[PDB]
């Protein structure tokens, strides 16, 4: 029984933009959550529907590790029952979410002198995302009566916005890397157990 590939997610060189968040399926392995509790300076570590001390014992059928980058002020939106541009239009947790949300400051990796163009978020969307939905559409957003046909202009907005992370921004505007763990618990045999 080999170790679950948590290092590949937490130690990715580059993270995904929140609108195109990454998901890693984790199965048929053995995970170690105790090391993750004291793995670094995880500013956020909130578990929902399960206890972090109990995580090192329970087994699960499937475990998903979703990862992305957001603003510091937006970290509060990665939680059940939240609203905002992130929870509504980029990454949505269900109300009965069973898992943990892990976030840490990454201003030394994901910011650029002059602003980083590499990280984006969906600013415009007609409706809210369903839980765990992923919308990578880059259609020009129609804000008026007349359709756009890929032409930007008045009432025709490119739907994604860059954060422009700079190393000198305040904490609320700095980049934060987020890892969301989900613990699917089906009637199938469990394949992911702690140690």
């Amino acid at each position, epitope marked *: 029984t080999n170790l679950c590939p948590f290092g590949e997610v937490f130690n990715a*060189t580059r993270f995904a933009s929140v609108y195109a968040w990454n998901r890693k399926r984790i199965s048929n392995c053995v995970a170690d959550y105790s090391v993750l509790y004291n793995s670094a300076s995880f500013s956020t570590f909130k578990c929902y529907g399960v206890s972090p001390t109990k995580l090192n014992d329970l087994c699960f059928t499937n475990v998903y590790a979703d990862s992305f980058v957001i603003r510091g002020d937006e970290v509060r939106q990665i939680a059940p029952g939240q609203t905002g541009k992130i929870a509504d239009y980029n990454y949505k947790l269900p109300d009965d979410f069973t898992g943990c949300v892990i976030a840490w400051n990454s201003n*030394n990796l994901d910011s650029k002198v*002059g602003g*980083n*163009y590499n990280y984006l978020y969906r600013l415009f969307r007609k409706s809210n995302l369903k839980p765990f939905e992923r919308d990578i559409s880059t259609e020009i957003y129609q804000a008026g009566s007349t359709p756009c046909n890929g032409v*930007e202009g008045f009432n025709c907005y490119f739907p994604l916005q*860059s954060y422009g992370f700079q190393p000198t921004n305040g904490v609320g505007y700095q980049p934060y890397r987020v890892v969301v763990l989900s613990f699917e618990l089906l009637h199938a045999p469990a394949t992911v157990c702690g140690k």
Partner: antibody, heavy 123, light 109 residues
């Protein structure tokens, strides 16, 4: 297939200006940014600046600020670079280079380059 | 203005050798480091971006490593079409992109 076809070699006199073009094809022109990188004879590459095709936003290198101008003709998928008050040390090969685009991040890398335009400044 | 330096300044090698080129930044650039190949008279071509990820169409013998200030480009088995000048480039500063001086690799005899 991405293609960037630059204008021909230019011979300018000291003080004049030169406008180098870069015709793009094989991709959506607006979704990407175009940088200009020059290379003096037997030297390294040097970033002059860049232009965003969608809005026209420009960033120049501080030593060329006020002396270089980059424009984008979205109607013909062509980028332009204009360098004025030419001196002898501006003799170089001038490349246009598109970046990965707005989706992967402007200016993060240059995945495609033009063939180069040689600009010779001499009295 | 971040300064990029490369060592060795020049390199002699044979076909089949393991080539290693070093790039150094005057301050931490995180992972915003790219590698380019350039043959005489032609334009540069992207080899590595994000310090270690490979561009589409680039052979698997090219690899990159590094983060912060010290970066490394490795060609596991050199081929005749790999003799050229290799430049590194930082994208940490979108106000001032800077390149390394370039390391030329020639045929050893």
């Amino acid at each position: 297939q991405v293609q960037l076809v630059q204008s021909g070699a230019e011979v300018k006199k000291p003080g004049a200006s030169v406008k180098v073009s870069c015709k793009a094809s094989g991709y959506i022109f607006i979704r990407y940014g175009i940088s200009w990188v020059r290379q003096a004879p037997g030297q390294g590459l040097e970033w002059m600046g860049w232009i965003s095709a969608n809005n026209g936003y420009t960033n120049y290198a501080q030593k060329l600020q006020g002396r270089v101008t980059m424009t984008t003709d979205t109607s013909t998928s062509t980028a332009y670079m204009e360098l004025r008050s030419l001196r002898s040390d501006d003799t170089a090969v001038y490349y246009c280079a598109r970046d990965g685009g707005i989706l992967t991040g402007y200016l993060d890398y240059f995945d495609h380059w033009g063939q180069g335009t040689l600009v010779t400044v001499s009295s | 203005d971040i300064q990029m330096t490369q060592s060795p300044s020049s390199l002699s090698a044979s076909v089949g050798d393991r080539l290693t080129i070093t790039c150094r930044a005057s301050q931490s650039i995180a992972s915003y480091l790219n590698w380019y190949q350039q043959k005489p008279g032609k334009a540069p071509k992207l080899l590595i971006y994000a310090a270690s990820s490979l561009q589409s169409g680039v052979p698997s013998r090219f690899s990159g490593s590094g983060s912060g200030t010290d970066f490394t480009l490795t060609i596991s088995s050199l081929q005749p079409e790999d003799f050229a000048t290799y430049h590194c480039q930082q994208s940490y500063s979108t106000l001032g992109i800077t390149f390394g001086p370039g390391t030329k690799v020639d045929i050893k005899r």
